[PDB]
Design a protein around this ligand. Structure first.
Ligand SMILES: [Mg+2]
Ligand SMILES: [Mg+2]
Ligand SMILES: [Mg+2]
Ligand SMILES: [Mg+2]
Lengths: 175, 159, 187, 168, 75
RNA sequence: GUCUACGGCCAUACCACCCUGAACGCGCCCGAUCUCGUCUGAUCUCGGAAGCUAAGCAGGGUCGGGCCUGGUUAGUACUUGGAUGGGAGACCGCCUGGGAAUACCGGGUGCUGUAGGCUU
RNA sequence: AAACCUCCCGUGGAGCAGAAGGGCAAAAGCUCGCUUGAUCUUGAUUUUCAGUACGAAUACAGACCGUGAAAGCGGGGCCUCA
RNA sequence: ACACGCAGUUUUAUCCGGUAAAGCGAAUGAUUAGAGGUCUUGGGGCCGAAACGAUCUCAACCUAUUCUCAAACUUUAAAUGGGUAAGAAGCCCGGCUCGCUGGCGUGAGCCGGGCGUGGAAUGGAGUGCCUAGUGGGCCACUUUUGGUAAGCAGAACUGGCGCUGCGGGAUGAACCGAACGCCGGGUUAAGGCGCCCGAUGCCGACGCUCAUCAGACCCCAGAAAAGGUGUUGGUUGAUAUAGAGCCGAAUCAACUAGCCCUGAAAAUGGAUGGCGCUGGAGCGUCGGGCCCAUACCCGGCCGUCGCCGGCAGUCGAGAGUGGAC
């Protein structure tokens, strides 16, 4: 599985009806996937991992993207992880600060890949929950919980190094 | 290299199944096999006479000759370049009727019935078989109860 | 890159006769025009048989032609042969027939004309019946040559009746070990 | 919930070459009239066809075409098989001469039979020569792996339209 | 100077090159390999088929007349 | 409802113990001149109907064993096809499809053909 | 502890000449009674196979038989080599 | 304007197996340890002249358990795979023949009559003669035998090199892509975009890493066990205003996973391809844009193959008439 700018999809599915069980129950899951085609595959993978259901023996009842309810508010997201290392698997809890839940999940994937060299296929997303300012364990998120937060830009290394390449003036880093 | 023994490698092929040894049931002895009957061969270790070769075990052929207690079956056999239609003599105990042709015969009779019938009606009926079509879009009614969430289970070492 | 086998792309069938004689070429040109223009398939068959080699058009005996014309229904029809009509000496009564052939033996020609029949060439057939209407197309026995007695399942094989290539038949040239049950085995 | 119908029409594109192909895979490919790379065809979806497409998943990229996709494929790159010869569909006379006995007399009838698969889908589809599509403009993602894991092979149910636009 | 003993590596391609053929089934297969008594009885039955042919001819004529009468009655 | 004679599928039919058998029937049982065979009429064979369900036999019961059939085990083990996936390797994960078997926990404990009886 | 006799349990855990595998319980094992189908003769088929031989084997058929009340079985060894 | 037959395919039915797995509380064999057994008998022993009288012990066994196994074990038992059937050579009637078999009957063979798209998708098929060269092979994914291992020896399936050029892997048998007539334009695959060298000369995104042996892409050209408060995340567990004499706010311990470091020594001077690179030109996850192979698309030309191809000179485009009288 690859990763891009992930979107949250709600997928509802059930096993195909049979004369023994006329009305099978409906199951839903939260799947973060680049598109719906891979969202269905991830839903089937997780359902087969949990229930005795396969794609051939079941069907997808509803698949739809879940829009962010408050895209304009900054929120703290807690994500519970289940990934595989070179050694055995481990359980993790990570906190991220983003405007959207899908953005938080993308940040979680990027951070896991950067810090533990874990690919997307090895990572299972268990639960993503928005959290208030309190109940945050990671000081990195907590240090931004300040109404009177101040910080300058000390070392602004200039870009456009190849905009006109030869100049008589050396650049400036203090602004 | 391996030996050229006739019964080499037949330790389990020519062996009675579990708790099914002893006297051969007499139903197999009193079944008739007309000419042109499709028959699949399965060897039986209880009877040593009329024993088919190991290469014909599980093969299906057609009966062309009949004797007092054996029949002649033409069975296709592939030998490294081609399929040879060769005839062998097999005793009755290693012979049973094949049920592959009876479904076709039943469908033929049903098609003949559907041809004689609905002919004076004027409406042509679908006689040819078709593969599984699309699943005939329908409605799913979740009366009251919402779909149940299925979160992944956190890992724990059990061993 | 397309995966197509080219081993069976060129068809081997003849397009023109291999003979260089000019009368056969003239007949070939006439029947090429007739076959490519007229919808009749008789002209197509005649063209294909004109393209054939000597062994592919074996001679037709007089007795066989008479017997074929003896069948009911095909009365008063013109015999069409792309081979050679050969006289048959072990038959006495020859009826009157209309025959078309590339070659007719002198004995056969004399016997046919004596009985009151007619002998025509293919250029005369085109004038008389351009579409080949009311004609019976016949050919000689293709397997009549002695080569086919040596063809098929090899000799010295069980259930085989193929004549072997022997310098001379005799008592002590063959029929020994390999053919005698007393000498080793037989097939 | 309203469950939409399983699509009855699919468009299959061969997305890899002819080197080192398994005998079963190549047999399925040549039964699908897909011998050259980047060739497209319409496949009627049923159990047998679904299994056949499953056999050759790494070698093909298929999906569910739209009305515009079949329109452009039949119009721009539509060639009919007449006398075992690839003849461009520049006139309705060829389509009539071929499929008049089935009620197909114009390109609209061909589009209707392909997009809405009917009784005469087999003859109409076999009449169409397999499409000679160009290389995908803008590049591919990964030829050697499945579409689910970021590649191009496999089923791309709705995304096949983008591939058709970039290849037709 | 030891050499390779046995293999079946390239054989499948050679087998499938010239279109491996199912044996050509032909109508009216031969009667070789059948018990002599049954063959003798069949030969005797076919030997005397010509006997009593007029009975078959009369029965066929009667059946044809009945079929023609039934066709006329239907029409 | 059930039995006898000949069977079909060959434990849902077997094994251990206990209880019940009205009628016909099946047997126990009474003897060895004739038929027959033994060291012994013990077995077999023959000749019978004084007693009996004691036994066989039939039905039922065992929180019975076994057997047959399900759930769990488990979408686990395993496995077709794929990757310029991870790992030094040993091996492992993922994509596309198929999919087990113990322990453990439930249900059941012969149907049936032909011919002839009894309950009339 | 092993001599012979009696009763019970006993799915074969013994035996079937041999090496091993398969198979076999009123047998294919043990004991008896009779016999020499371990006889004469055409073909067809199976194993290795090139689908050629040899050996081995499989269904038949035509005569002489053996055995049993009979149904049947037997033209060598229960089968896989000798 | 008009299709029989065949397939390294699938589907629907119907048969075959004993490998993976699993089991040995089920058979055979191996095998660990506790409870109840003078079941059985026997050795050392202790309380006893002795005593199956008390106490254990070691022997092979049993009664219910328990730990671990089997290429030459197995109750079960796959995935993959191997045969058949999916109709005209098929069905439904009527009648004859039989030195076969039979109570009547069978069974087979002969004649007459009536009923046609038999699952999906793709192919034009069938058949007969001559016939050269070959009969040293090798490599790779997967399964697998011997061997410590081998660029070792030997098997199964498939694909390649051999016999084959082209783009990429600096270099090159077998790797990745893709297979070849001579060209123009466009677009791609696998790979790349600091310079060599075509293209990121993006105002690329998020993190990690300092090496006085840094690192830099399948085959592949190199490293292990064990350690580090170097640094970055996670898991678990306690105590801290009832204060971990004074200061004062968060603190500690055990595991675990990334980068880096120690472990880490060979001989001509030396190789991520080199230069070089540390707000990377390194590592992990990722966006567009761009670079071009003999591959793909369009067009020109050459040749081969097929057209039941056309022209001995005529009406003519779903042809489904024309012309006397
Ligand atoms: Mg390749
Ligand atoms: Mg005899
Ligand atoms: Mg195993
Ligand atoms: Mg060479």
């Amino acid at each position: 599985k690859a990763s891009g700018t992930l979107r949250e999809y709600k997928v509802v599915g059930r096993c195909l009806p049979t004369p023994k069980c006329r009305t099978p129950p409906l199951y839903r899951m939260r799947i973060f996937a680049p598109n719906h085609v891979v969202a269905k595959s991830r839903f089937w993978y997780f359902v087969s991992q949990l229930k005795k259901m396969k794609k051939s023996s079941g069907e997808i009842v509803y698949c739809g993207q879940v829009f962010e309810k408050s895209p304009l508010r900054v929120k703290n997201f807690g994500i519970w992880l289940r990934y595989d290392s070179r050694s055995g698997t481990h359980n993790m809890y990570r906190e991220y600060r983003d405007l959207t839940t899908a953005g938080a999940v993308t940040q979680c994937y990027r951070d896991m890949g950067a810090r533990h060299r874990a690919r997307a296929h090895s990572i299972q997303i268990m639960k993503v929950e928005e959290i208030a300012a309190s109940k945050c364990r990671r000081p990195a998120v907590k240090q931004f919980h300040d109404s009177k937060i101040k910080f300058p830009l000390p070392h602004r290394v200039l870009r456009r190094q190849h905009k006109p390449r030869f100049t008589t003036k050396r650049p400036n880093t203090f602004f | 290299t391996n030996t050229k023994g006739k019964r080499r490698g037949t330790r389990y092929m020519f062996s009675r199944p579990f708790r099914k040894h002893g006297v051969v049931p007499l139903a197999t002895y009193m079944r008739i096999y007309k000419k042109g009957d499709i028959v699949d061969i399965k060897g039986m270790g209880t009877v040593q006479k009329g024993m088919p070769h190991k290469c014909y075990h599980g093969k299906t052929g057609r009966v062309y000759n009949v004797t007092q207690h054996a029949v002649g079956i033409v069975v296709n056999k592939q030998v490294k370049g081609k399929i040879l239609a060769k005839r062998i003599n097999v005793r009755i105990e290693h012979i049973k009727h094949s049920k592959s042709r009876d479904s076709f015969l039943k469908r033929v009779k049903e098609n003949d019935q559907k041809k004689k019938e609905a002919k004076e009606k004027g409406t042509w009926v679908q006689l040819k078989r078709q593969p599984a079509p699309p699943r005939e879009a329908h409605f799913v009614r979740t009366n009251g109860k919402e779909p149940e969430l299925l979160e992944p289970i956190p890992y724990e070492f059990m061993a | 890159g397309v995966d197509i086998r080219h081993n069976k792309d060129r068809k081997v069938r003849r397009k023109e006769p291999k003979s260089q004689d000019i009368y056969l070429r003239l007949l070939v040109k006439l029947y090429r025009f007739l076959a490519r223009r007229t919808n009749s398939t008789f002209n197509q068959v005649v063209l294909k048989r004109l393209f054939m080699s000597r062994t592919n058009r074996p001679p037709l005996s007089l007795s066989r032609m008479i017997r074929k014309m003896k069948l009911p229904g095909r009365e008063g029809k013109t015999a069409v042969v792309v081979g050679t009509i050969t006289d048959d000496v072990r038959v006495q009564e020859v009826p009157k027939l209309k025959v078309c052939a590339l070659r007719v033996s002198s004995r056969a020609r004399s016997r046919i004309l004596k009985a009151g029949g007619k002998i025509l060439t293919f250029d005369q057939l085109a004038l008389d019946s351009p579409k080949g209407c009311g004609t019976v197309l016949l050919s000689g026995p293709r397997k009549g040559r002695e080569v086919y007695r040596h063809f098929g399942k090899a000799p010295g094989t069980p259930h085989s009746h193929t004549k072997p290539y022997v310098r001379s038949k005799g008592r002590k040239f063959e029929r020994a070990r390999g053919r005698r049950a007393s000498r080793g085995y037989k097939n | 919930f309203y469950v939409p119908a399983e699509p009855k029409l699919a468009f299959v594109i061969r997305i890899r070459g002819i080197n080192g192909v398994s005998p079963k895979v190549r047999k399925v490919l040549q039964l699908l009239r897909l011998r050259q790379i980047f060739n497209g065809t319409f496949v009627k979806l049923n159990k047998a066809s679904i299994n056949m497409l499953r056999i050759v998943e790494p070698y093909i990229a298929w999906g569910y075409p739209n009305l515009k996709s079949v329109n452009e494929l039949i119009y721009k790159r539509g060639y009919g098989k007449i006398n075992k010869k690839r003849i461009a569909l520049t006139d309705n006379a060829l389509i009539a001469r071929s499929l008049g006995k089935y009620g197909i007399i114009c390109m609209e009838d061909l589009i209707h039979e392909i997009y809405t698969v009917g009784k005469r889908f087999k003859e109409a589809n076999n009449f169409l020569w397999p499409f000679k599509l160009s290389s995908p403009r803008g590049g591919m993602k990964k030829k050697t792996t499945h579409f689910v894991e970021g590649e191009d092979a496999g089923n791309r149910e709705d995304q096949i339209n983008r591939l058709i636009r970039r290849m037709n | 100077a030891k050499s390779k003993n046995h293999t079946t590596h390239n054989q499948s391609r050679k087998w499938h090159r010239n279109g491996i053929k199912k044996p050509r089934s032909q109508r009216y297969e031969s009667l070789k390999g059948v018990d002599p008594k049954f063959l003798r009885n069949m030969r005797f039955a076919k030997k005397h088929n010509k006997k009593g042919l007029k009975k078959m001819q009369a029965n066929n004529a009667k059946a044809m007349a009945a079929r023609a009468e039934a066709i006329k009655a239907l029409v």
